[PDB]
Amino acid sequence: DIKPLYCVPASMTLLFQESGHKKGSFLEGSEVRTIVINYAKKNDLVDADNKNLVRLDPILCDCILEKNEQHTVMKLPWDSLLTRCLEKLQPAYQVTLPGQEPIVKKGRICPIDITLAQRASNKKVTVVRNLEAYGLDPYSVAAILQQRCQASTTVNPAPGAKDSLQVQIQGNQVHHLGWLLLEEYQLPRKHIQGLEKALKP
C-alpha cells in the first residue's frame, strides 16, 4: 500500500506551468500522463501525418532530451514521451501509517532491511535499516522493541552513504520486527528484507 509519486524538478517547471503545478509539486503517474497529453494537444504538437507521434517543442526538448540537434524536428511516440517525462521527474512516494496522515518522501522506494549479525563470537544482534524511509522514528521503534523483545536496544548511525540511523536489538528478534512492521504499521511485505531469516513465522 505505498503510493508511487513524481516530484516536479526545476528543469520541468515550464512543462507543468499551464497545469498549475509548481516546482516541488507531487503528482501521481496518471496525473502526469493527463498533463503531458493535454500539453501536446493544447500546443498543437501532434504530428498531422502520423497521429501516433508528437513533435517536441523547445520546452519539451529542453526538459526531456539530452541533445537537441538544430534544424531537426524531434518526434516521439506518445508512450515514449510519457516514459521520458516520468523518468525525468524526481521519484517520490507516499506512506500511510495506521492512524496518521500520509507522509510524502522524495527518492526511490528502498526496503527496510532487517539483518542478523554477530557482535562477538557468540552474541547475535538484529539490525534494522531504513525505518525513516517509511516515516518511522528509530528512537520510538527502539523503545517499543526494547519492551516487546525484553532485550537492549540502541540507535546508531547506519554505515554507508545515506545519513540514516539504524536500530540494533540484542539477540535474534526478526520475528518481532515482522509483528511491528507488518501487523502494527501495516507496511507492505514486498518492501521489507530479512523477515525470511526469522526463527519462526
In sequence order, what DSSP letters do the residues of 10-76 get, joined into one string? GGGHHHHTTTT--TT-EE-HHHHHHHHHHHHHHTT-B-SS-TTEEE--HHHHHHH-S---TT---EE
Cα separation, 80 vs 83, in Å, equals: 5
N residues, the chain = 201
Instruction: State the CB neighbour count (10 A cutoff) for residue 179.
Output: 13
Residue 115 in grid coordinates: 539483518
Experimental determination technique: X-ray
* Max CA separation in the chain (angstroms): 73
Q: Report helix angle 78-88 to 29-42, nearest 10.
A: 120
Q: For residue 112, with 0-12 CB atoms within 10 Å meaning exposed, 13-18 middle and 19 or more buried, which class applies?
A: buried
CATH number of the domain within which 180 lies: 3.30.780.10
Range of the domain at 154: 112-197
